[PDB]
Every structure is written in structure tokens, then in C-alpha cells.
Amino acid sequence: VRKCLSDTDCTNGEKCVQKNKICSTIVEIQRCEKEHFTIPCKSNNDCQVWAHEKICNKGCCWDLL
């Protein structure tokens, strides 16, 4: 994980995901939004913004289903 506050804190063309303040590729941002209506993550810690527990699963913040 690389933490960020804006896109200029990221590397390799990655963007800052504002909801969880982590860097992610555009492809991963697009995939998590399109496939799962959610945000990318590297670990469970990147999914803590919801009071109702979510998990990091397969690169996106998932609900328990």
C-alpha cells in the first residue's frame, strides 16, 4: 500500500482513492466500481471507512454476503 492525499503522492501513474486515501491504478479503480460498486484495497485495513464491517477481497472492499 501507498498512502496519499492527492494524485501527486502516487507513482507509476496511479491515482489517489479519496475514500480510503490509497494509491491505485485506474484499471483497478474502474474494476472495483464497475464489478462491485466499491473501491480498491490492498488489505482489510483499507476498508475501515464503513462502520458496518467490510473486507478486502480480490482487490476491492467487499461486504460479507
Partner: protein
């Protein structure tokens, strides 16, 4: 008030659903009965509907909805399936043939305490409402409480976790009540436990990567089922083992039912893929139930033709 005046296109309370159970039985007394399989942690009755055209201990299909209380489209779909069975039996030939050989058991509100709590206190509640010694966090994940891979990787030891497995397998009376029913019956041939959301149809295992012995048949049936589902509105479901399709999950229902020799053990995740998630608009209840019913029919027909 009758089951014809009931509004299938809106979400209901526990009391309203329980009224629907009674009206359906009263309207169809020779097809439908209501069985109390237990009482919840907080003392509420737990009810299963039996749909049967006769016989003794006939081969049977079990369907449950609402094991996770926040998954409201599942309970709403279960109400619709119940009405659907009574509508089609004697009218639609194919379904008539199904119920002439098989019984169907349907548990619409599988976690009544959680369901009450989702209306009263916390719309996003998932778990049971049991108290746990040594914690102020309430509830056990009823889909981590079964005695198949219980307490292994794929569940949490933290009572505050959404996937807390409980102190021991079958600690939750809501789970134990089904266990007792299933073992006493001894002749359930398919067991389908319905969740939302994500648009998936899954088969064992959740707790390990080893392929289930009937993997290929179950994967073949899954493809046929999701194809039937898709025919109505084009809703896309993926399919596979629980562990491959979602994540590792231990002590889950269909791993236990499969271990009881119930070959056609399936779990659904209904609409949607996350746009609304658990808060699916009420205008999607009936379409969701309709398309899901097509998948259920595929499974029932396969069960019928593989006796």
C-alpha cells in the same frame, strides 16, 4: 385480507410475514402446512412451510431465506416463492409434476431476531442476537456456525466480527433447529440457502480448496440454472464453489448439508452487484423472485430426474 391482497412488491415486518404464512395455510390447507422447528434466542417462533401433495417422507427440496437478516430481498423473495407454489400447483404441468413426487420445505425468515432488529434498531444487522460471555458484542454469524469445518480458517474468533463463529458448532438455536429438522427428516435431496447480494450461484466447499466429489455435475447444473435465470431479464450470475466465487468461509450451511449426503447443496447470492447492495429497491423484489424461481426450477427438475 388474503394472500391475494398482500403486496408482494414491498418489504414487510416479521409480524406481516408471519400473517402471510397463516393466510397461505388457511387458503391451501391440503397443500400447505406450517411447522414450528424451534424458538430463537429471544424466544420468537421459527417456522417452515411444507408444500406436499401426500406420501410419507417423500424426497424433498429445502429452501431457506433470511439467514442473514439484512438481506431483505431474500425474505421478500421467499414470500413470493410460497405464493408461487400455490399458484402453479395444478395449473402448470411441469411444476405439478415436481410437487407430485417431491415435497418442498421453505423457511422464509431463518433469523427472526436479526430480522426484527433490522427494522427496530440497525438496518444493516447480519448476525443472530445471542449474547456471548466475555464480550459486550452481540450475535454469531449463523453461516459460520455449522459443523462442517467449524472454527477453521474462514471465520473469526472475535465476537464483534461479522463472521464470528460462536462458542461451538450449532450454538445458535436458529442453526440447531434446522440441523435437527434435517437429520430427523433424513430424505432431503436438495438444500438451497439463499443470500444477497452479488448475483452468484455456489456449491461446496467454502472451507477448503479441495473439489467437492460431485463438482462437475454441480457446476454443470449451476450453468444450466444461471442460464435459465438470465432468460427473463438478462441478469448475469457467475457460479462456482463458495471458496472460489466469494471467499473462504468455514462452518457454512451447504458444506454441512453436503456432509449429510445432500448432493444438491447450493447457495444463492441474489441481486444486485453492489449498486444498492442490501438496500435493493422494492421495485426489484418481484423481478428478483421471478428470475430466481427459474433457477430453482432447474435445480428441482435435475433433482427429480436424478433420484
Amino acid at each position: 385480507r388474503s394472500t391475494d391482497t398482500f403486496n408482494y412488491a414491498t418489504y414487510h415486518t416479521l409480524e406481516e410475514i408471519y400473517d402471510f404464512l397463516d393466510l397461505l395455510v388457511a387458503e391451501n390447507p391440503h397443500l400447505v402446512s406450517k411447522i414450528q422447528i424451534g424458538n430463537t434466542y429471544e424466544g420468537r417462533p421459527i417456522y417452515v412451510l411444507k408444500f406436499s401433495t401426500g406420501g410419507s417422507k417423500r424426497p424433498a427440496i429445502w429452501i431457506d431465506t433470511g439467514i442473514h437478516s439484512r438481506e431483505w430481498v431474500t425474505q421478500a423473495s421467499g414470500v413470493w416463492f410460497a405464493k408461487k407454489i400455490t399458484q402453479d400447483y395444478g395449473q402448470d404441468a411441469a411444476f405439478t409434476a415436481i410437487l407430485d413426487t417431491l415435497d418442498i420445505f421453505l423457511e422464509i425468515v431463518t433469523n427472526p431476531d436479526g430480522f426484527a432488529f433490522t427494522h427496530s434498531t440497525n438496518r444493516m444487522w447480519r448476525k443472530t442476537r445471542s449474547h456471548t460471555a466475555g464480550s459486550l458484542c452481540i450475535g454469531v454469524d449463523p453461516n459460520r456456525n455449522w459443523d462442517a469445518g467449524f472454527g477453521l480458517s474462514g471465520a473469526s474468533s472475535n465476537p464483534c466480527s461479522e463472521t464470528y463463529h460462536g462458542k461451538f458448532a450449532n450454538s445458535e438455536v436458529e442453526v440447531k433447529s434446522i440441523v435437527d429438522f434435517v437429520k430427523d427428516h433424513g430424505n432431503i435431496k436438495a438444500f438451497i440457502s439463499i443470500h444477497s447480494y452479488s448475483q452468484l450461484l455456489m456449491y461446496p466447499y467454502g472451507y477448503k480448496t479441495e473439489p467437492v466429489p460431485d463438482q462437475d455435475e454441480l457446476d454443470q447444473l449451476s450453468k444450466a440454472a444461471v442460464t435459465a435465470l438470465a432468460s427473463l431479464y438478462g441478469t448475469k450470475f457467475n457460479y462456482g464453489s463458495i471458496i472460489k466465487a466469494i471467499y473462504q468461509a468455514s462452518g457454512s450451511t451447504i458444506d454441512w448439508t453436503y456432509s449429510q449426503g445432500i448432493k444438491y447443496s447450493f447457495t444463492f447470492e441474489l441481486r444486485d452487484t453492489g449498486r444498492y447492495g442490501f438496500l435493493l429497491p422494492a421495485s426489484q423484489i418481484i423481478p428478483t423472485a421471478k428470475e430466481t424461481w427459474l433457477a430453482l426450477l432447474t435445480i428441482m427438475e435435475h433433482t427429480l430426474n436424478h433420484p
